[PDB]
Design a protein around this nucleic acid. Structure first.
Ligand SMILES: *O[C]1[C]([C]OP([O])(=O)OP([O])(=O)OP([O])(=O)O[C][C]2O[C](N3=[C]N([C])C4=C3N=C([N])[N]C4=O)[C]([O])[C]2[O])O[C](N2[C]=NC3=C2N=[C]N=C3[N])[C]1O[C]
Lengths: 621, 151, 748, 103, 52
RNA sequence: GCAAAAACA
RNA sequence: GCAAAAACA
RNA sequence: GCCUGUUUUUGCU
RNA sequence: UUGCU
RNA sequence: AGAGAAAUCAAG
């Protein structure tokens, strides 16, 4: 522990309760120095006998009663303030061990004892050298030199010299004016000494109340929330194109396409469609970056901040007031349930093609079997296709944002099937961007293929009819502003598959551990509150729409969603406790539902989760 | 150019039970990576990962336990990625880096324990340099003309 | 050659002096601070730039070279046109490493082997463990610290810096650093890193060396009695739903060290104040070249005797109370386990006593045995509650009976007698276990029966087994329960070598000798019990005589004490050794007489090692087992050891001791080399910042061999001039004598 | 100290030998296992080879078709044949003489 | 190095069956084959003169 | 690694 | 010790 | 832009 | 210049 | 426009 290596364990133990080291300057160093002196005393009195008894008797670190008991028999007496360290019976002289930093200038001390002065290098004073034997000198020099080596190894030379000299600076001291500065904002001194008797009073407190029924999360009222996301989701579709590169696919599409406006929104003027076509042209000859056109100003909001500032200044009137921002509250839209019902239908392709890990052991075999089962139960699903589309679009748009450009960049969304045919999900146009931070927005124009058009779901989307090889498709073409951090996050959106895989693997492995054998084909009947009533349901489709809802929450993650999910865990735990006949008690002013209700403003999936929570029973018998 | 490595598009070599195993060693053990390419990817003289400054090396049970020469990171796939292009304090810290590097080269023992040499940096490294040259087993004239040029 | 290295160092020093006039006028110790200034190595977020960085036109930054062609087939490799010559300036494509994987200069095979050595160890270690069968059981985790990776040697942390310094920089070390290092680890590391240091830099080589000889324990959830004693394959052998049954022996010397410690404890308890005796002996016994204190600090095991010896040296222990197969740990208690000195006297005058232990107050004790684990809460001697987690249909006889014995809850066997008067503690405890094995109704009458069928314990002690009635107050474990201690426990070694744990209201017994059961085992290799007072531990007569002769020859005071105690029939700490070395004979009085002539003629005999050898030979013969019947005869010139063909000679011309004028060899080892390497060690004797007027040896080794009376070593700009030791005694002995005299004077 | 190193017999096995020379010197002809013994006697080598082959198995089963390599006459045979004849100072043969009863 | 004397130590890892070790434990029988010839030669000289 | 027809390790 | 990454409060 | 504390995973000195 | 299911 | 949510981006 704190014992130096050269100090003997017995000496260290004996020195613990000899002086109050905490109040002394450099208490540890002082204790080490006292141990040095005691070890020197031990080395002086080493196996030396005169009349069958030890020649030297050591008075250091011994009880004072016995010291006086043996001091009377020697016809001597010493005061309490300074007692000699040892005494020589053969010569009958009291000796005190001293350590000094310079033997050249040393002077005697009080005549009650003689000083055995030693240097930090093991040297001894001339008289001290002549009194002791050569073996004692060598042993003392060796011990002191080992101590010096320990000191220089630990860089403690200054402290050791200070303790030897005895100046003993307090190692810290607060001056006069600094104390006045410190005591400005407090009613106590530097060391507070209140004049009150320590006591804990009795305070009349409130009563803890049982939560007999679970709280009911309030549902906001207002217009249904529009689809506020970067991409379409379940309405996303693609166009089949002959196998080849992205440039070849875009050239094939552009040369064989007809665009006709069928629904125009005020948020996204239809006149910007030319922009997209221009980008197609630019990307047809392998130029993903094109010069600006007029409609780009409308499309990407070029110089919009300055125009809005001038308009505000022209229309400015009244008196300055605080900000007082307002967030519009919107109700749960009908399209969330349709999104849940969709996005789950089976697909022809697997849409999850992950290279299989190596298999060496049976543990590896069962792990890869479980992963393969999960992939084949959630692979052929619209969620996987939409996840692939989102990841491809996010990566393609992110890769074009680590620079400053005043031109228009095209980021096509193209995937490929096992057969090799291209699949056109849409294109992303990145406008003039000069990013200084990772959180600022950049303009984007998102053209993508719909499957079905809803006015109440896409109010800011201008839907176009696209004719390609006697085939009809719909086009979204929305104007948006999106950030670098969000794009990077959605570039790794494939990680959302872990949580439903976690549920599936936990169920399967729990069943395996219960039966002490792995089945790998279990599809048990999970009991769930479906329509306010508890019904059974297969595990595979449970994992399927768990993945659906996880993806829906991942793309709709905002402060409201973060707060709602963070505060819903307490209510989830309370419900789980009450279904096991456990009572829940709450403090006086306890309203756990308020911290959840404050986060329910306009997020459609937060409202969907709130409705799901309200649907299930609140009272458990 | 066959891939032969995970970052080169080869089939994964790490399994669930081989999370802790290095890729190169595991591929060598399984025979997926022959010695012909092993002697190339693990070259300590490859230009890809060659350090810009000479480095010091120990020599166990050797007359001169300190050999300084050019070095490269063994794996050619441990390269560095180029970056696009308190100000004077950064130059001061670069000077501190230079002093730390020369101290580490001349005082290997502080590489394992705390620094406790007495005196200033200049005098301490001067004495250590004189001592190490004195123990170089070279002849006398070499030693004198080497210590002649020490500032 | 070495000349280029010196040129490079001189030029670097000159550049540092010139480019940085400051930053070097500071003290050298200031390196401990300004080494931490490593800014400009900071980047915002490399994970958010990798995709873009790889796809830049010239992503890779490298130093200029001619090995990489400017333009390869079709493609252009390096951008060596813009500013060629500015250090790490050249920019190359992402495919350049791929181009180097082929069509590149190769390297010798030993270099490749050296680079991959550390990882190849892990690879073969994984592809060497026998992969068992997966067993699924819904495991209940036990969170404990386990070692991250196996080590080639076990070295205590305090000795880590000195060991590495002995491997890489012997020339900058002192003899104290040499003695504090683990020389076996030093040799292993030197052999391992001789090729490695040729391909790894200084700091890298130090890193691999320390990683090979450091523990670096980390907290993980493992499974009871299935820990792989290393976290290297924890992700593979256990996943909270299964384990892989793996077979692995101890592959360690911990058991041998336990055997040595047990022998020392057993032999120490037979003398006055066993604690001081054991502490003194452990400070003089060495294994290989390492002192016993440091090897005890190295092996921090779970074993009782090892824990006793570690506590005797001021170290801690991880031993836990264990009754046969069940381990117990007190989670919390109001008062320690109070001992009861219950007497079962066989007669009014003849008495036999069997002390036991119990709880006074409320206590809670976790227990585990095999896959069964849980806790029990009790008050005094009445059991209050039991929580158990165990596999279904498991037999819970032995864990419950171990609980009963631990708490003395059941009293057909506590506070009263079984029947016929017990012979002793061993027989009484064995009778208790054998009686209660076939009679578990004491448990049932202790905690009654319950009419509720949800209780999992059956009356016949089977977990979750249907029955008519169920045992009350024994239920399934609700939540995970595990022993954890927050404050670092400090252990007290009381008399009879009892290791107590410091509880708040008293002392908690942890280890108690006289009921620790362990058969005699092999001693650790390289054990040197020639220190003092314990030589009969050696079973071999060869080593048993060798240690005694090494003790006598190398120490004049020990030889004098041995002769004095062996001549006048005094108490000799090695009487058993002398009796067991010499067969029954009739040479006692003749040898004693010879001792008389050779002490009277030359009273100054105890300085010539030859005279010491002759006197020791005569003394060993003198105190042998004298035959009762046959008359005394003259002492033979040479004799034969018991149960061996080893011949011991007076003149030491042949056999166990050979004393040529140049050197003395005892048992095949040169104990004395005349002229160089005196019997006594060295003392440091001076620390200087300037070259002393002595000989500067290269390393601590190449010193202690020339036998010089003055030699200096270098360490961090300081010089240490070891000279010689002339004092016959030792600092430890001096301190012990002074403290003993002080305590005796206090008592008297 | 090692002079010549062979991949078939690693240097570390000397630690085994010095572990035995010491142990046999202490009256222990049989000693406990050490780490260097692991690669000294083929301990767990069958499991190592089988698991490595299973992990690296590829292709399809074919006939074993074992072969033995043909190797020429070593240059050291004549030195062996002439060096076994070196004269020795001792008889090196100790056979107990039988009794004699007839001519 | 033993008593300033040089030697070479050859270490080999091998593995042999109990049959081979037992057979080589009785290797002294190899002395039988040559002696026969010598013996015969001696008897041959006897067959030359009936005087051994 | 030992063998010599895949054995032992 | 330094640099990066992550989680938690 | 990017605090403090704890823990964890890498790599470099 | 552009290709993650 | 838009992104967005208690105040910013929408370049000089
Ligand atoms: O913080 C940290 C510490 C901790 O760790 P441990 O475990 O304790 O161990 P050690 O190291 O031994 O400790 P100390 O004594 O305190 O220290 C020592 C000395 O030496 C040096 N080093 C070390 N190492 C290991 C190293 C070094 N250097 C280099 N370059 N490399 C290496 O490796 C130091 O600095 C000191 O002075 O400790 C330390 N550490 C750890 N690890 C590490 C360190 N450092 C650095 N590096 C590393 N890697 C720290 O502090 C200082």
């Amino acid at each position: 522990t704190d014992r130096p290596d050269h100090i003997d364990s017995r000496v260290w133990e004996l020195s613990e309760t000899q002086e109050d080291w905490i109040t002394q300057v450099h208490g540890h160093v002082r204790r080490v120095v006292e141990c040095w002196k005691y070890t020197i005393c031990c080395l002086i009195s080493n196996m030396h006998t005169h009349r069958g008894a030890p020649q030297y008797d050591v008075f250091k670190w011994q009880d004072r009663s016995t010291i006086e008991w043996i001091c009377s028999k020697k016809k001597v007496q010493y005061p309490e303030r300074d007692t000699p360290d040892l005494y020589d019976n053969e010569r009958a002289v009291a000796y005190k061990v001293l350590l000094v930093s310079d033997l050249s200038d040393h002077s005697p001390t009080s005549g009650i004892y003689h000083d055995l002065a030693f240097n930090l290098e093991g040297e001894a004073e001339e008289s001290c050298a002549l009194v002791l034997r050569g073996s004692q000198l060598q042993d003392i020099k060796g011990f002191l030199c080992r101590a010096l080596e320990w000191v220089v190894s630990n860089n403690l030379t200054q402290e050791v010299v200070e303790t030897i000299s005895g100046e003993a600076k307090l190692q810290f001291s607060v001056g006069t004016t600094f104390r006045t500065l410190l005591k400005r904002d407090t009613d106590w001194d530097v060391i507070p000494t209140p004049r009150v008797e320590p006591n804990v009073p009795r305070i009349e407190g409130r009563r803890w109340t049982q939560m007999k029924k679970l709280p009911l999360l309030k549902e906001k009222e207002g217009p249904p929330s529009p689809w506020r996301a970067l991409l379409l989701g379940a309405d996303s579709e693609y166009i089949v194109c002959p196998p080849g590169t992205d440039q070849e696919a875009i050239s094939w599409i552009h040369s064989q396409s007809e665009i006709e406006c069928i629904r125009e929104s005020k948020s996204t003027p239809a006149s910007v469609i030319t922009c997209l076509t221009s980008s197609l042209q630019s990307f047809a000859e392998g130029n993903p970056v094109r010069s600006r056109i007029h409609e780009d100003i409308i499309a990407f909001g070029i110089n919009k901040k300055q125009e809005k500032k001038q308009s505000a200044s022209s229309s400015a009137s009244g008196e300055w007031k605080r900000a007082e921002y307002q967030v519009e509250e919107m109700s749960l839209p009908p399209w969330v349930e349709e999104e849940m019902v969709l996005l789950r239908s089976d697909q022809e392709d697997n849409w999850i093609e992950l290279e299989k890990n190596a298999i060496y052991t049976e543990v590896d075999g069962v792990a890869e079997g479980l992963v393969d089962k999960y992939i084949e139960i959630v692979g052929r699903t619209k969620v996987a296709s939409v996840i692939e589309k989102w990841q491809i679009a996010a990566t393609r748009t992110f890769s074009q944002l680590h620079t400053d450009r005043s031109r228009i960049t095209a980021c096509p969304i193209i995937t490929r099937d096992p057969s090799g045919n291209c699949q056109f999900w849409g294109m992303v146009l990145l406008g003039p961007h000069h990013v200084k931070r990772d959180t600022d927005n950049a303009p984007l124009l998102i053209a993508e293929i719909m499957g079905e058009d809803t006015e109440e779901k896409y109010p800011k989307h201008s839907v176009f009819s696209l004719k390609v090889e006697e085939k009809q498709f719909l086009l979204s073409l929305k104007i948006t502003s999106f950030s670098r951090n969000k794009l990077y996050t959605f570039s790794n959106i494939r990680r959302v598959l872990i949580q439903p895989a976690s549920i599936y693997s936990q169920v399967v492995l729990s069943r395996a551990a219960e039966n002490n054998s792995l089945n790998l084909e279990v599809n048990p009947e999970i009991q769930l509150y479906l329509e306010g009533a508890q019904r059974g349901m297969t595990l595979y489709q449970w994992v399927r729409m768990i993945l659906c809802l996880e993806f829906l929450m991942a793309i709709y993650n905002n402060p409201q969603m973060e707060g709602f999910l963070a505060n819903m865990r307490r209510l989830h735990m309370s419900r789980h406790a009450m279904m096991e006949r456990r009572q829940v008690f709450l403090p006086f002013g306890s309203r756990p539902e308020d911290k959840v209700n404050e986060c329910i403003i306009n997020n459609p999936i937060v409202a969907y989760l709130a409705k799901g929570w309200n649907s299930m029973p609140n009272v458990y018998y | 150019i066959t891939p032969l490595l995970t970052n080169q598009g080869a089939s994964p070599v790490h399994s669930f039970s081989t999370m802790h195993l290095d890729e190169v060693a595991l591929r060598r053990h399984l025979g997926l990576l022959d010695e012909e390419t092993l002697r190339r990817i693990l070259n300590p003289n490859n230009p890809v990962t060659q350090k810009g400054d000479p480095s010091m090396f120990f020599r166990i049970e050797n007359k001169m336990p300190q050999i300084m020469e050019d070095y490269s990171v063994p794996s050619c796939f441990k390269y560095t990625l180029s970056r696009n292009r308190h100000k004077a304090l950064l130059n001061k810290e670069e000077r501190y880096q230079r002093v730390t590097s020369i101290i580490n080269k001349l005082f290997p023992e502080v590489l394992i324990q705390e620094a406790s040499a007495p005196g200033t940096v200049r005098e301490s490294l001067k004495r250590r340099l004189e001592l190490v040259v004195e123990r170089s087993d070279l002849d006398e004239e070499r030693k004198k003309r080497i210590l002649s040029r020490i500032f | 050659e070495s000349e280029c290295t010196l040129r490079a160092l001189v030029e670097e020093y000159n550049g540092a002096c010139k480019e940085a006039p400051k930053e070097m006028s500071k003290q050298f110790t200031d390196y401990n601070t300004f080494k931490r200034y490593t800014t400009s190595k900071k980047d915002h977020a490399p994970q958010m730039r990798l995709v873009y960085s790889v796809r830049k036109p010239w992503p890779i930054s490298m130093t200029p070279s001619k090995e990489i062609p400017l333009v390869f087939n079709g493609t252009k490799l390096k951008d060596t046109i813009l500013d060629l010559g500015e250090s790490k300036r050249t920019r190359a494509n992402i495919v350049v490493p791929d181009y180097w994987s082929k069509y590149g200069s190769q390297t010798s095979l030993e270099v490749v082997n050296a680079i991959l050595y550390a990882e190849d160890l892990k690879v073969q270690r994984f592809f060497s463990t026998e992969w068992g069968e997966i067993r699924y059981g819904r495991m209940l985790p036990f969170r404990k610290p386990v070692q991250a990776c196996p080590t080639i040697e076990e070295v205590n942390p305090a000795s880590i810096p000195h060991t590495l310094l002995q491997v890489f920089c012997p020339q900058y070390t002192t003899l104290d650093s040499k003695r504090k290092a683990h020389m076996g680890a030093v040799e292993k590391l030197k052999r391992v890193m001789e090729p490695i240091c040729k391909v790894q830099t200084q700091e890298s080589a130090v890193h691999i060396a320390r990683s090979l000889i450091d523990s670096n324990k980390k907290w993980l959830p493992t499974v009871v009695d299935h820990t792989p004693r290393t976290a290297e394959m924890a992700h593979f052998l256990c996943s909270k739903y299964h384990y892989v049954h793996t077979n692995t022996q101890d592959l360690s010397d911990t058991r041998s060290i336990d055997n040595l410690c047990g022998e020392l404890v057993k032999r120490s308890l037979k003398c006055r104040c066993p604690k001081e005796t054991l502490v003194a002996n452990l400070d003089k016994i060495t294994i290989q070249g390492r002192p016993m204190r440091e090897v005890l600090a190295d092996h921090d095991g779970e074993l009782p005797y090892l824990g006793i010896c570690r506590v005797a040296m001021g170290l801690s222990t991880h031993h836990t109370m264990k009754i046969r197969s069940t381990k117990f740990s007190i989670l919390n208690s109001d008062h320690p386990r109070i001992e009861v000195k219950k007497v079962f006297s066989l007669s009014p005058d003849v008495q036999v006593t069997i002390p036991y232990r119990r709880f006074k107050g409320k206590a809670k004790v976790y227990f585990q045995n095999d896959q069964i684990q849980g806790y029990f809460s009790c008050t005094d001697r009445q059991i209050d509650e039991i929580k158990i987690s165990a596999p279904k249909n498991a037999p819970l006889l032995e864990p419950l009976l171990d609980i009963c014995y631990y708490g003395s809850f059941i009293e057909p066997g506590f506070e009263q007698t079984f029947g016929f008067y017990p012979a002793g503690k061993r027989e009484f405890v064995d009778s208790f276990f054998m009686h209660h094995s076939k009679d578990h109704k004491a448990f049932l009458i202790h905690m009654g029966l319950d009419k509720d069928l949800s209780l999992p314990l059956s009356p016949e002690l089977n977990w979750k087994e249907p029955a008519l009635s169920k045992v009350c107050r024994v239920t399934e474990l609700d939540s995970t329960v595990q022993p954890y201690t927050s404050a670092t426990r400090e252990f007290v070694l009381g008399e009879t070598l009892n290791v107590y744990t410091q509880h708040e209201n008293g002392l908690e017994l942890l280890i108690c000798p006289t009921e620790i059961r362990s058969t005699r085992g092999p001693l650790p290799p390289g054990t040197n019990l020639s220190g003092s007072e314990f030589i009969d531990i050696y079973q071999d007569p060869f080593s048993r005589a060798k240690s005694l002769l090494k003790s006598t020859i190398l120490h004049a005071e020990r030889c004098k004490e041995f002769v004095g105690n062996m001549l006048e029939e005094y108490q000799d700490p090695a009487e058993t050794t002398v009796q067991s070395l010499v067969p029954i004979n009739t040479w006692g009085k003749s040898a004693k007489r010879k001792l008389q002539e050779e002490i009277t003629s030359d009273p100054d005999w105890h300085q010539c090692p030859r005279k010491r050898a002759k006197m020791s030979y005569l003394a060993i013969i003198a105190g042998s087992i004298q035959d009762r019947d046959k008359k005394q005869t003259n002492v033979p010139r040479a004799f034969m050891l018991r149960g061996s063909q080893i011949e011991y000679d007076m003149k030491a011309t042949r056999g166990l001791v050979v004393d040529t004028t140049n050197r003395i060899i005892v048992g095949g080892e040169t104990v004395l080399r005349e002229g160089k390497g005196g019997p006594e060690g060295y003392v440091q004797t001076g620390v200087f910042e300037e070259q002393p007027r002595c000989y500067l040896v290269d390393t601590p080794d190449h010193g202690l061999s020339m036998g010089l009376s003055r030699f200096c070593v270098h360490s961090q700009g300081r010089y240490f001039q070891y000279e010689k030791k002339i004092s016959i005694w030792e600092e430890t002995d001096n301190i012990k004598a002074t403290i003993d005299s002080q305590r005796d004077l206090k008592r008297r």
